[PDB]
């Protein structure tokens, strides 16, 4: 049965973990997968998470299955983060949320729900985007088409190209938008641009799917949701796949949410019964631990205050690392102007290193980035900054 | 986009939770979903699990992503439970295991792996079986066909009918076998029958997929795996989807495993790279908490001893409840011979109640079973036994 199966290529992002682990050299520097590291180059459990976990250990009295859509309080806290307290979507009961195993899980649930229950055949994704978007949608049987997004010469959102790419999208196609911290470019629409896209997609009949994996890492929780809220105000229907992996440092507990929005509560409840059927046929019901930590934190004033300050701390450290990286490249002799990096949002720097420069950085210098040239700025520290920049300068 | 979506039917098993929750009557009795309850009608966290969780709280220093296939020690402990310490499959490195979100997740991963990477088009499932089997395989695009299994008149495995149903299976079809505690019938092949099926499926070219959600609930961990081991000894290739939800009481943490076996290590490693690609496109990587609890327990002599005795305790309580149920039906005037129930394996009693009797038990008596007539014996207690049996007698 299996004699003839050809090997899959290693994953361009997660596959780096294997190579990095196998590299026995001591000065290695990991700027690959999008995890946060603190000033010591560690990814600790957040203190608010440990506190919540201690509370759960003391107070949980069963592991009985959650509902297919997960913890109700988790869904309500998620909708409030996405749409804002007092949102009409919430008041009108127009949104249903399933807790999912990670943002990836939420994208797969959305895709299977769309493929089985609507006329959707194609999803439009930005070029460039996270490489696993294509894989997830294709796995559900949906075609993926790309829309232009990035002007590499000026390091800006090429809004005219984006518009004119999307003119090929038909009514009823899905268009995927990253909510904030575009991966990999770090370049987000301004609010006015978000508003322009909202009106365009209503006019053109696109179904918006927002990916929201980095809420809080661009400017802050509420500001980062402004683009999604501009869409929510204009559309009867949309879907949001959101993750708490990064903003709670809960990567391996798989905590995400798929939120379905429709014109009214009768419609969303009917549609949502098919999303639950899709989940049941996939992983049955979602893992409680990480979601219960998030719900415990978000629903407790003290834990929430601790957590929101930890999120602010991560965002500000990454911003300090952006400045230091730009400053140190200059000092180590780069010559090129890299100041555009300071303006990028989120964990990454997309600096125009070629695939061969990235390969050379790994093989010769033990510095690990993704082949697209995406670098995890959140993996930089004052101690590894000098060697990292010396290596980059050496490959330029 | 969603105006026209027709509502999904509620799930025949998980949907009971909603109805039971909404039923405001005080004497309700829950014999529906397959969770264990102790003598107080509660589903507590196992003591070995709490201990492991305390250890994790004290010792975990990151939530950084696991590999796509999860915790290595978890995979190794899983293969040892399935195949036995010293198994040739293990020595020859012929098996790869991915940790998955539950047994359901492992079945979906197997199905997507098969659909995308082999010529498999059809999976054969016993009539009756767990209703979500059909849903999972169909969601991956595979057809499901049924094979005869149960002689309801004599309450036995109708082995001749099973054989003659399966003559219609082609070489290269998958045949799904429940490892032990067949759900819903509680009727398992004897070892000699397992051995006969192993030789038959090799001869006929069927790919065996074992579902193993109840290891330890029939007779014990090792005895319950004898059928799978009879298959492993005869086949070059098979897949096992196994769950730790029930035998660790970890239902909501979603702890399962998909184990792929091929003729040699080169083949299984190549095949497994495509199973990992399928996982990446689904939920990316699996939830650490429940799996890390299982690995922590299975890899520690003291915790393992505690856990194995807790598993024995659950199995023996269910066996005491089977006897008490049969005895009490007799005392409350059933008249029918129900002694066949004592011999059934696992959590359930499949007693021949009709769908209408089950509906009447819910509506009129607040007693909740599944429409197929499956009753969760693990939900019976000395205190709820009298009322439960009075209700059943009243509907006969
Ligand atoms: C745009 C986007 C959407 C969805 C995900 C996955 O989040 P999850 O862990 O499933 O909650 C990521 C995260 N990307 C990371 C890590 C990875 O590739 O798995 C990265 O790009 O390095 C992402 O960047
Ligand atoms: C044969 C079989 C295979 C797979 C599963 C799901 O296990 P998981 O929770 O995903 O690890 C169950 C469990 N069945 C239960 C609970 C349910 O239906 O979800 C039941 O039949 O009541 C099962 O009975
Ligand atoms: Cl509902
Ligand atoms: Cl490997």
Short mmCIF file of N, CA and C in Angstrom, two decimals, chain B residues 159 189-197:
data_model
loop_
_atom_site.label_atom_id
_atom_site.label_comp_id
_atom_site.label_asym_id
_atom_site.label_seq_id
_atom_site.Cartn_x
_atom_site.Cartn_y
_atom_site.Cartn_z
N UNK B 159 -19.63 -14.58 12.88
CA UNK B 159 -18.36 -14.61 12.21
C UNK B 159 -18.55 -15.02 10.76
N UNK B 189 -13.90 -10.25 18.81
CA UNK B 189 -13.38 -11.54 18.36
C UNK B 189 -12.61 -12.20 19.50
N UNK B 190 -12.66 -13.51 19.58
CA UNK B 190 -11.76 -14.25 20.43
C UNK B 190 -10.39 -14.16 19.80
N UNK B 191 -9.37 -14.52 20.54
CA UNK B 191 -8.03 -14.57 19.93
C UNK B 191 -7.99 -15.44 18.66
N UNK B 192 -8.61 -16.61 18.69
CA UNK B 192 -8.56 -17.47 17.52
C UNK B 192 -9.22 -16.76 16.36
N UNK B 193 -10.36 -16.11 16.60
CA UNK B 193 -10.98 -15.31 15.53
C UNK B 193 -10.11 -14.16 15.01
N UNK B 194 -9.48 -13.42 15.91
CA UNK B 194 -8.53 -12.39 15.50
C UNK B 194 -7.48 -13.01 14.58
N UNK B 195 -6.99 -14.18 14.96
CA UNK B 195 -5.91 -14.81 14.18
C UNK B 195 -6.39 -15.22 12.80
N UNK B 196 -7.61 -15.74 12.76
CA UNK B 196 -8.24 -16.09 11.50
C UNK B 196 -8.41 -14.86 10.60
N UNK B 197 -8.86 -13.74 11.18
CA UNK B 197 -9.04 -12.47 10.43
C UNK B 197 -7.71 -11.95 9.97
#
